[PDB]
Design a protein around this ligand. Structure first.
Ligand SMILES: *C(=O)[C@H](Cc1ccccc1)NC(=O)CCCCCN
Ligand SMILES: [Cl-]
Ligand SMILES: [Cl-]
Ligand SMILES: [K+]
Ligand SMILES: [Mg+2]
Ligand SMILES: [Mg+2]
Ligand SMILES: [Mg+2]
Ligand SMILES: [Mg+2]
Ligand SMILES: [Mg+2]
Ligand SMILES: [Mg+2]
Ligand SMILES: [Mg+2]
Ligand SMILES: [Mg+2]
Ligand SMILES: [Mg+2]
Ligand SMILES: [Mg+2]
Ligand SMILES: [Mg+2]
Ligand SMILES: [Mg+2]
Ligand SMILES: [Mg+2]
Ligand SMILES: [Mg+2]
Ligand SMILES: [Mg+2]
Ligand SMILES: [Mg+2]
Ligand SMILES: [Mg+2]
Ligand SMILES: [Mg+2]
Ligand SMILES: [Mg+2]
Ligand SMILES: [Mg+2]
Ligand SMILES: [Mg+2]
Ligand SMILES: [Mg+2]
Ligand SMILES: [Mg+2]
Ligand SMILES: [Mg+2]
Ligand SMILES: [Mg+2]
Ligand SMILES: [Mg+2]
Ligand SMILES: [Mg+2]
Ligand SMILES: [Mg+2]
Ligand SMILES: [Mg+2]
Ligand SMILES: [Mg+2]
Ligand SMILES: [Mg+2]
Ligand SMILES: [Mg+2]
Ligand code: NA
Ligand code: NA
Ligand code: NA
Ligand code: NA
Ligand code: NA
Ligand code: NA
Ligand code: NA
Ligand code: NA
Ligand code: NA
Ligand code: NA
Ligand code: NA
Ligand code: NA
Ligand code: NA
Ligand code: NA
Ligand code: NA
Ligand code: NA
Ligand code: NA
Ligand code: NA
Ligand code: NA
Ligand code: NA
Ligand code: NA
Ligand code: NA
Lengths: 53, 337, 132
RNA sequence: CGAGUGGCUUGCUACCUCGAUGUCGGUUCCCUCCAUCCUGCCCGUGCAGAAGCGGGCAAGGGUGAGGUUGUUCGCCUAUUAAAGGAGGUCGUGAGCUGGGUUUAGACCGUCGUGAGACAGGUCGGCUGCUAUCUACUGGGUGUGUAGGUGUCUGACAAGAACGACCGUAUAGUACGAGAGGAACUACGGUUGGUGGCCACUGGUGUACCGGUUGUUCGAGAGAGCACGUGCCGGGUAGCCACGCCACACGGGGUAAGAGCUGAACGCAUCUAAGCUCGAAACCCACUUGGAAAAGAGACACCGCCGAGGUCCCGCGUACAAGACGCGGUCGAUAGACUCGGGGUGUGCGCGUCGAGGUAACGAGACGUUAAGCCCACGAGCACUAACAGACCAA
RNA sequence: GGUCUUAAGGUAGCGUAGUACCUUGCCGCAUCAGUAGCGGCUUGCAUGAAUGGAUUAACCAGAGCUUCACUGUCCCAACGUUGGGCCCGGUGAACUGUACAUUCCAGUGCGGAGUCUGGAGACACCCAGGGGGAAGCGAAGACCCUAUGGA
RNA sequence: GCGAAAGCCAAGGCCUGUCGGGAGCAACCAACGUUAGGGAAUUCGGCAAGUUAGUCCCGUACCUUCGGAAGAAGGGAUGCC
RNA sequence: GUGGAAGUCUGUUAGAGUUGGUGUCCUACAAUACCCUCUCGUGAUCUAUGUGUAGGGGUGAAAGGCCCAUCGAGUCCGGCA
């Protein structure tokens, strides 16, 4: 699997899946990502993110 | 009315004092069923990671499916049965009779023992067989020690010595089996005793926490509400009733917590290998790198990283052995981050 | 009951206010008890995903209000662990009113549902729009 | 109607304390009783089944959360296997609380000429002390057994280390007109309790990194203060629970009870002698402590001019002193350095762009730059420091 | 009852009251559940007109209740910060002390014993702890009664 | 900055609110920070803590002794260049 | 619009007061202290100094409050052994 946020590979037996109100799903590899997300930031704008890279 | 409630903490692991030996001492051994064989082995704790396994359970609606399982990596290099001790049955229980030692010793066993320079193996052996002829021979065990020098991550070189029982077919047959092992050099390995998939009982001295209060040591509540602001936060209500006018040893009080021996039952051996396959990136925190004989124990094991832990075939298993479980993935991800 | 096939950290207590994920006319539900549960001194009875809880209607249609009904917990904010180790959490806490036979009192379920709830309440599941 | 047992209620008595034994309730924490609420094993039934009702053994474990009331009690709600009662100075204020009772202030009603009174109501109304002894939880130093190292034994001691529930198969089966509806056994899970552990999730993380407000160091750069982080955002290690792992069965002897063989009493009889079974209870099993067990233990090796130990030095798998454990050049024990593995989130400077502005100036954007800064972890590495050396000892 | 004591015999209002014994009165609101609170009823143990009655905008560190919001008050506790605490140098009190004292379980005794009686346990000394007991220390009981006491 | 307010800083004063040294510095205590999900279930009682917050614009109920209630409530804005 | 009233409002301006924490202290720093919280803050306001009222007497927006840590009758000595 791949983190729906930063893009790096999610180490198996790890991570969280957040189910949205509408039903959408979002796998996170870590708290760091989840948290950057809750701040309303988009991975594309964070230079450390594989996505942005 | 005062609602009922179980007492705080168990009264079966006391007194809660510091352990006499950092090296565990089993007080029970498996039953003499199968072929003769040493009933235990030892190693040093290193750390934890998880592994993906194929549901092995025949009764699980998930049998055959992936499954993440927590594992504690334990370096289990070879050990050496340096002697065979014999016990005799007497009106006062079992007592050591004699011992059969060898000559081939590990370079640094003298860091702990006054290694034998002159011993009579045969006389000992004779005395034992005569005892057996007379039928006073009590169980047979081997004096064993570890080779810490074989484990880089562990600072000590001084070997840890412990006695392990030998359970086998007949007494004669296992008596012989013992001597054979010893005579060689006593060199044996985890393979020779355990097979991945079997259940073992792991013993060890827990992580020490020095002195601790009742709340942490016994699980008593914290003062609640207003009471927590009056001057008392972590002290129990009272040491007892007016009468009996003495404090009963059963009331939760402060003291040594941790560094106690514990024999944790039915631990499943997920795998027994050798190499660096189980090591984590960056190295096991406060331990080091693994690259040699190892064992993967399901779940947790008492004691801190580097501490000696002991294995013994489960003495009271609940499930039947399900040998060599399929391991599809062993995480090597850094434990830092 | 049947194994949920996932570990749960009850994220609710007696007295908690959760969402009613259905069209029964009940909007808000107040947890009153957890079926088959017995706690321990001072402990607040707890409930999570897959539990059948007794509830009272706090908000909704006048006729539904104040009624004491049964329901099933379909979603909770507090994480749950699935067999492969992954954690799963939702955007809100929700339950669906059920009857004696455990058939939804309503006709439609609003929002997603945890797959685990299926292995327990079939008719509730077979009425789901989305099953994560 | 008669005979009793208990000492929880209420009353009686005035033995004990008025040079004071701190009140009610609650709370917290410990032990116990059985007249048993649930659970185990049983008997009867107006026992078809299911669900009950009544009784016997039985105190191992459990007996929970809430709404009114200071309440104890009690009423009420939803859960539950069940949500039993009672003793411990109506256990528990050198533990807490202080709502009530029961000081001084005040009001109402009633009573009184009045002061003032009223288990009538009402608002407000304080909680002292540095532990000598003893008691227990844990930690040491000595002596005794009578040189040392290592490994054991087990008299005894503690445990609830496990209690309970739901679901599936059995089975829509036995039973029953039907409605309805079991069990043995085998499985999965939950709950409470218990011990441990941190890969995973989560908390902290005044290590660290970034953003930014006010002010001061002229600006810039880089910094101090704003309570012991200014505030905001992220967070490693460790510690943790909200996270994760583990916690039988089975033997032996019994109770109630079901029976066998069997006599007194040729018959009958579970009992008198004998015997087969049979409880969550008892014993063992399992975990923990345990040579100070005065019968003060056993074994192996080393040593009595030398075995071993203490001090010393570098450190922690240990730690309030003490203790404990490891390493000490025949070395990787700690530090430096360099890698590895991690945390932040892209440094200073310079270049280009930039709403504009004559210009000066210019918030900010892009590049250089996964940059800069930082790390309580690992590895490599004898470079630095584990040197020198003292002592006790049959 | 359809007058009598003793002059009159409770009017407007208010009312289960900060006044209501019975009492958690009855009905309703509100809550899953409300001895509370509010509204209605009200025969008021024992309301009521300057012993002021009713009522009332504004005001209140005044008493009670409800809602939203909030949150470590709680479920259930954890980690952290600072000052202590612990070890070391220096300084250096007090409370309290009939004696003896390593106690425990029972009993007995002026009926609430470390010291009596019977048993059990118990090698000595020391460090830290939280306070079960010494009916712990502190105060010639402030309650109650008694005194041919006091104010 | 509304300010004789906070915070920071001069001039001036001081390191005498006068015992120190050591242990990652344990239990426990005083002050205090942060705590996931729940959100008063705590308790006599929300005690303690928390929430809200400055300024401008919009907007503002019952009741009222017409003064008030009222900053009711609720909604939006807020920097730098 | 002007004006700028008020035993008016907000306010740790100064200053006055003392509600809760039943916190800290309780052989105290203190024979009434410390901290946070809280009330008033143009008036029946607060305050310094001077001055008057004296013990069955004062003084008292009244609590039997206060009259030098002393008040339901101050303190000292005497009556008094
Ligand atoms: C009634 O029970 C009295 C009430 C009282 C007496 C005096 C002052 C105020 C209140 N309470 C007592 O008598 C308690 C006595 C305590 C004795 C303790 N040793
Ligand atoms: Cl408490
Ligand atoms: Cl409940
Ligand atoms: K008395
Ligand atoms: Mg991760
Ligand atoms: Mg207090
Ligand atoms: Mg980690
Ligand atoms: Mg409670
Ligand atoms: Mg006392
Ligand atoms: Mg009985
Ligand atoms: Mg018992
Ligand atoms: Mg009592
Ligand atoms: Mg009690
Ligand atoms: Mg006491
Ligand atoms: Mg007291
Ligand atoms: Mg005290
Ligand atoms: Mg009171
Ligand atoms: Mg009151
Ligand atoms: Mg009275
Ligand atoms: Mg009162
Ligand atoms: Mg002697
Ligand atoms: Mg600072
Ligand atoms: Mg009423
Ligand atoms: Mg009149
Ligand atoms: Mg005696
Ligand atoms: Mg007296
Ligand atoms: Mg009196
Ligand atoms: Mg008189
Ligand atoms: Mg929280
Ligand atoms: Mg409540
Ligand atoms: Mg309660
Ligand atoms: Mg408050
Ligand atoms: Mg004013
Ligand atoms: Mg003001
Ligand atoms: Mg004057
Ligand atoms: Mg008076
Ligand atoms: Na206190
Ligand atoms: Na306090
Ligand atoms: Na007492
Ligand atoms: Na009797
Ligand atoms: Na006395
Ligand atoms: Na009490
Ligand atoms: Na029982
Ligand atoms: Na109640
Ligand atoms: Na008492
Ligand atoms: Na009390
Ligand atoms: Na008290
Ligand atoms: Na049995
Ligand atoms: Na001995
Ligand atoms: Na009247
Ligand atoms: Na006032
Ligand atoms: Na806190
Ligand atoms: Na005591
Ligand atoms: Na000085
Ligand atoms: Na005008
Ligand atoms: Na004050
Ligand atoms: Na006088
Ligand atoms: Na005189």
């Amino acid at each position: 699997r791949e983190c729906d946020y930063c893009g790096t590979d999610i180490e198996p037996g790890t991570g969280t899946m957040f189910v949205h109100k509408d039903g959408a799903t979002t796998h996170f590899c870590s708290s760091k990502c989840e948290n950057n997300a809750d701040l309303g930031r988009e991975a594309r704008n964070l230079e450390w993110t594989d996505t942005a890279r | 009315p005062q609602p009922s409630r179980p007492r705080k903490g168990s009264l079966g692991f006391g007194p809660r004092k510091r352990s006499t030996s950092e090296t565990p001492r089993f007080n029970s051994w498996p039953s003499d069923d199968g072929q003769p064989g040493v009933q235990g082995f030892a190693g040093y704790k290193a750390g934890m990671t998880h592994v993906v396994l194929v549901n092995d359970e025949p009764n699980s609606p998930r049998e055959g499916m992936e499954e993440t399982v927590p594992v504690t990596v334990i370096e289990t290099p070879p050990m050496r049965a340096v002697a065979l001790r014999a016990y005799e049955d007497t009106p006062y229980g079992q007592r050591p009779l004699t011992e059969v030692w060898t000559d081939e010793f590990h370079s640094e066993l003298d860091r702990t023992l006054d290694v034998p320079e002159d011993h009579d193996p045969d006389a000992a052996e004779e005395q034992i067989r005569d005892a057996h002829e007379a039928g006073d021979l009590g169980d047979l065990r081997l004096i064993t020690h570890t080779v810490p020098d074989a484990v880089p991550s562990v600072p000590k070189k001084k070997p840890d010595v412990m006695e392990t029982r030998v359970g086998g077919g007949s007494v004669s047959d296992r008596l012989d089996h013992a001597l054979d092992i010893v005579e060689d050099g006593g060199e044996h390995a985890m393979n020779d005793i355990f097979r991945a998939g079997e259940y073992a009982d792991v013993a060890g001295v827990t992580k020490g926490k020095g002195t601790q209060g009742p709340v942490k040591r016994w699980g008593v509540q914290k003062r609640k509400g207003k009471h927590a602001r009056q001057g008392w936060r972590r002290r129990i209500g009272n040491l007892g009733p007016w009468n009996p006018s003495r404090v009963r040893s059963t009331v939760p009080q402060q003291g040594q917590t941790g560094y106690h021996q514990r024999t944790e039952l039915n631990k499943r051996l997920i795998d027994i290998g050798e190499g660096d396959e189980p090591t984590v990136d960056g190295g096991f925190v406060n331990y080091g790198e693994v690259d040699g004989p190892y064992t993967l124990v399901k779940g947790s094991v008492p004691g801190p990283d580097k501490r000696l832990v002991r294995f013994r075939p489960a003495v009271r298993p609940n499930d039947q052995p399900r040998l060599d479980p399929e391991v599809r993935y062993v995480s090597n991800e850094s434990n830092q981050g | 009951m049947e194994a949920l096939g996932a570990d749960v950290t009850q994220g609710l207590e007696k007295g908690s206010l959760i969402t009613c994920a259905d069209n029964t006319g009940a909007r808000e539900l107040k947890v009153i008890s957890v079926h088959g549960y017995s706690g321990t001194k001072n402990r607040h009875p707890k409930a999570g995903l897959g539990d059948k809880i007794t509830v009272s209607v706090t908000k909704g249609t006048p006729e539904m209000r104040r009624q004491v009904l049964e329901a099933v917990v379909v979603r909770q904010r507090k994480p749950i662990r699935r067999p492969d180790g992954t954690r799963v959490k939702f955007e809100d806490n929700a339950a669906v009113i059920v009857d004696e036979n455990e058939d939804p009192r309503g006709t439609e379920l609003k929002g997603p549902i945890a797959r685990e709830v299926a292995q327990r309440f079939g008719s509730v599941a077979s009425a789901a729009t989305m099953i994560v």
